[PDB]
From Swiss-Prot, chain B:
Organism of origin: Bacillus subtilis (strain 168)
Designated gene of the protein: ppaC
Places the protein is found: Cytoplasm
UniProt-recorded name of the protein: Manganese-dependent inorganic pyrophosphatase
Pfam family of the protein (one): DHHA2
Needed co-factor(s): Mn(2+)
Length: 308, 307
């Protein structure tokens, strides 16, 4: 049976790790040959989930073409967020919930994206469509993904489908989703032993907005001041990235997960576009984004319109 | 509120009927959809529409003047779509082509399956939503599958397509083989067609790496009838190659009885057809044994050859 690799985006989050694991499980339970893998380091939030449900981290890879011919993408599509040698392999399927850009195939494929709050919400449907029992631990990881992406059902990307899936997955996993999820989210918001290099990369994604090359990085925190007091050090590593990668904009989005508000730190030639996007005045490279917590819903589309 | 649902430029039976079907499903679910088309209805589609007593969808050139959001069926690439696609939101795509030249600013419902017909996906979606398919609509959907599968003979045809057609022909009340052979024959009637119509009725533009390509297909029961018209075909094809700055125009003339096609290749990259299919062009043509499907047997090998 031909082996495939299943993985999500660089700088993996809980949905990208757990959805890779769950989809590989669903493929293997159906008699196929899948290995879930990851493209970077496991963050504290994901590690809490993996540890709680006694699951291993997926194997770390840098490339796929040395290993297999065919891959499945979960939780992303854009080339520049994917494995570095993505053009050397065939993308067989994509299960996702981001916007689509920078994605092309030579041949028809199974592309399944729904505008829902979490990729694992789609995978939940797929288990059922295929009449495969979701094991307790798998359900736990899928629930983790949903709580992560929805910030415990508070993010505006969260839909009724995500809430229903989480309800099913929590009963199967044997946990209280509120209690568990609060602890899980807090594990990811622990910024104590985090360097600024880590802060600006742990949840970084690159985009091309029109002709403009952009990186948007997000940080979950229980206290914006703890991050903001590192501003000079953050500006230094972000500046290095802006130069190195020839970005028109690096936007760091520092999210208060308790208040659902974010502080923007914008660096690069196109910083003033953030002002247009959000109707704010940047003062010393920062501004308050009231209510903004979702990159896919509240940052990418308005920043696209502003940049163009 | 209002949305428009349509398929590609140079509409085929799947593009017309799937737009009709999905609008019906949306409206039965209480939404507000109208199926539209981006060009002339071909003789095969017209057979289907006439047989199941259904009108042709309204022809449109633009969408942004009418609605804010659209749904694409049976295509995704920008240059295959409505003139002003950049001005509207793509809310959903239901499709079975390769993906290229397609970007959205926000998440969407993107649903592609590598099956033989878009209508096979829609059949599934009616069931998922517990909505009955009306007899006429089932016939249009059946027509789409027969059209795209060349009566289940094309290598794009899967067990799912066959199962959908079986259910649909039963709902519609027709013998699928009998009706299908007649429908297909109506599309292969090249008796009143100009050469301009031959190279355009089932034409699609692609970007193959850095190369600008147009691939047109025609159904025939007699390749010699079309090959008789080579000089005239080369005249109109060359015009297009110049006007659109194409690296290649590939005309695929398909014997639907024998499942073989004749290629007519014009353009600076004509020799890449020779690499793609391991054939030699003699007077711009070569027999492509077994080749009937653009999405599966043409676009991928031609992409490889050209890069
Ligand atoms: Fe993610
Ligand atoms: Fe996600
Ligand atoms: Fe079509
Ligand atoms: Fe089609
Ligand atoms: Mg996430
Ligand atoms: Mg995220
Ligand atoms: Mg077709
Ligand atoms: Mg076709």
């Amino acid at each position: 049976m031909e082996k495939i690799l299943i993985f999500g985006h660089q700088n993996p989050d809980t949905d990208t790790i757990c959805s890779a694991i769950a989809y590989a499980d669903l493929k293997n339970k159906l008699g196929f040959n899948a290995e879930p893998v990851r493209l970077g380091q496991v963050n504290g939030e994901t590690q809490y989930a993996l540890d709680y449900f006694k699951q291993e981290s997926p194997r770390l890879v840098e490339t796929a073409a040395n290993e297999v011919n065919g891959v499945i993408l979960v939780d992303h599509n854009e080339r520049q967020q994917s494995i570095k040698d993505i053009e050397e392999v065939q993308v067989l399927e994509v299960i996702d919930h981001q916007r689509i850009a920078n994605f092309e195939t030579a041949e028809p494929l199974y592309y399944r994206a729904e505008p829902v709050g979490c990729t694992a919400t789609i995978l939940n449907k797929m288990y059922k469509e295929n009449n495969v029992k979701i094991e307790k631990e798998i359900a736990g990881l899928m629930l983790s993904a949903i709580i992560s992406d929805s910030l415990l059902f508070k993010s505006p990307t969260c839909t009724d489908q995500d809430v229903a899936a989480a309800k099913e997955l929590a009963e199967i996993a044997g946990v209280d989703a509120e209690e568990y999820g609060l602890n899980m989210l807090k594990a990811g918001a622990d910024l104590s032993k985090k360097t600024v290099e880590e802060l600006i990369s742990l949840d970084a994604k690159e985009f091309t907005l029109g002709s403009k090359k952009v990186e948007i990085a997000q940080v979950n925190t229980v206290d914006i001041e703890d991050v903001k007091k590192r501003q000079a050090e953050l500006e230094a590593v972000i500046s290095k990235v802006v130069a190195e990668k020839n970005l028109d904009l690096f936007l760091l989005v520092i999210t208060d997960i308790l208040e659902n508000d974010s502080l923007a730190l914008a660096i690069g030639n196109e910083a003033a576009k953030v002002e247009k996007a959000f109707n704010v005045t940047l003062e010393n490279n920062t501004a308050l984004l009231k209510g903004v917590v979702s990159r896919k819903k509240q940052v990418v589309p308005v920043l696209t319109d502003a940049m163009a």
